[PDB]
Amino acid sequence: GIVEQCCTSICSLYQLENYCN
């Protein structure tokens, strides 16, 4: 999930947009 990807590691803007609706 997002925690592992953006909290634990670092996320680009493009990886953040995968969690938009």
Place this chain on the structure above:
Amino acid sequence: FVNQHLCGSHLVEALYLVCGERGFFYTPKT
């Protein structure tokens, strides 16, 4: 865009800004 570990409410606010009117889903469930 910032290049940093976004956690807690900092990750949620980020999602709000980036998703806009689209809205988003926040499911921390590992």
